[PDB]
Amino acid sequence: SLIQFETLIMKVAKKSGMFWYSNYGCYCGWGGQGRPQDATDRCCFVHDCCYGKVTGCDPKMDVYSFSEENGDIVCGGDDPCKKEICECDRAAAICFRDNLTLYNDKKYWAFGAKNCPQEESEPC
């Protein structure tokens, strides 16, 4: 569920998702339109696309299971649809971590919709 995604961003990237990734660029936040603006924004675009392709369960409310071992987040449980939500969230938390070199809140926080024209919307 979304609370577990916040948790994975805190564990993996050592940052709050609600503080640093809830209104950044065109896609980090609910929905999105336009071009991914930089690497962190493309991590958000891929996470949107990933949630968009989960069929069988609900990425917002279902609770998934995971363990930490061999130095990684390991998605588990007996339900394959809930394991795919977990995989979407794990991938995005790692992408954020790996792209901290480029993160630029000064330029991309609250970017604004004319900068994200609906005619430049990249398809998943």
Residues lying near Ca ion in the complex (CB under 5 A) are found at: 27, 32, 48
Q: Is the Cβ of residue 27 or residue 66 nearer to Ca ion in the bound state? A: 27
Active site (annotated) includes residue 62: no
Smallest CA-to-CA distance from 51 within 61, 39, 38 is with 61
Q: Which residue in 70, 27, 15 sits closest to 5, CA to CA?
A: 15
Measured from the CB of residue 35, what is the shortest distance to Ca ion in angstroms? 13
Q: Tokens 């989960």 identify what position?
A: 54
CB of 1 to Ca ion, least distance (A): 16
Establish whether 47 is a catalytic residue. Answer: yes
- Least distance in angstroms from the C-beta of 116 to Ca ion: 11
106 φ/ψ angles, rounded to the nearest 5 degrees: -55, -40
Contact predicate 75/90, CB 8 Å: yes
Going by the annotation, the residues of the binding site for Ca(2+) are 27, 29, 31, 48
Catalytic residues: 47, 89
